[PDB]
């Protein structure tokens, strides 16, 4: 199983980008996926999980009220909706999945997730001029 992010790049400050990142290989079923972020020089962090139903979703703090999670399952892959951004979210955006995980939505644990992706790097420019 195989994973891989679409949809970063540069955006303006308060703009809005969807990543997505579908998965690849022999697959089982679908299971639990997640997002995660860092920039340079910082710990790898938790952006957002969802359950291997689609029915349960998790967000960090930076999240809430601004990202949403989906996934379809057809498809087996996984999607953040960011609305409004700002510089402070700029980073490289990382999604993972958890193949063990038969209940509930992702730990925002990096060391629970087996399989990751490359990255997809978001960079938000300030409004000035």
């Known amino acids: 199983v195989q994973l891989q992010e679409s949809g970063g790049g540069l955006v303006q400050a308060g703009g809005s980008l969807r990543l997505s990142c579908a998965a690849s290989?022999?697959?089982?079923?679908?299971?639990?996926m997640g997002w995660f972020r860092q920039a340079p020089g910082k710990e790898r962090e938790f952006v957002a999980s969802?359950?291997?139903?689609?029915?349960?979703?998790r967000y960090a703090d930076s999240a809430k009220g601004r990202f949403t999670i989906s996934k379809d399952n057809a498809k087996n892959t996984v999607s953040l909706q960011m609305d409004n951004l700002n510089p402070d979210d700029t980073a490289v955006y990382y999604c993972?999945?958890?193949?063990?995980?038969?209940?509930?939505?992702?730990?925002?644990?990096?060391?629970?997730?087996?399989?990751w992706g490359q990255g997809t790097q978001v960079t938000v420019s300030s409004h000035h001029h």
């Open positions: 993972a999945a958890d193949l063990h995980r038969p209940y509930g939505p992702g730990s925002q644990r990096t060391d629970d997730y087996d399989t």
């Open positions: 290989g022999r697959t089982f079923s679908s299971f639990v």
């Open positions: 969802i359950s291997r139903s689609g029915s349960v979703t």
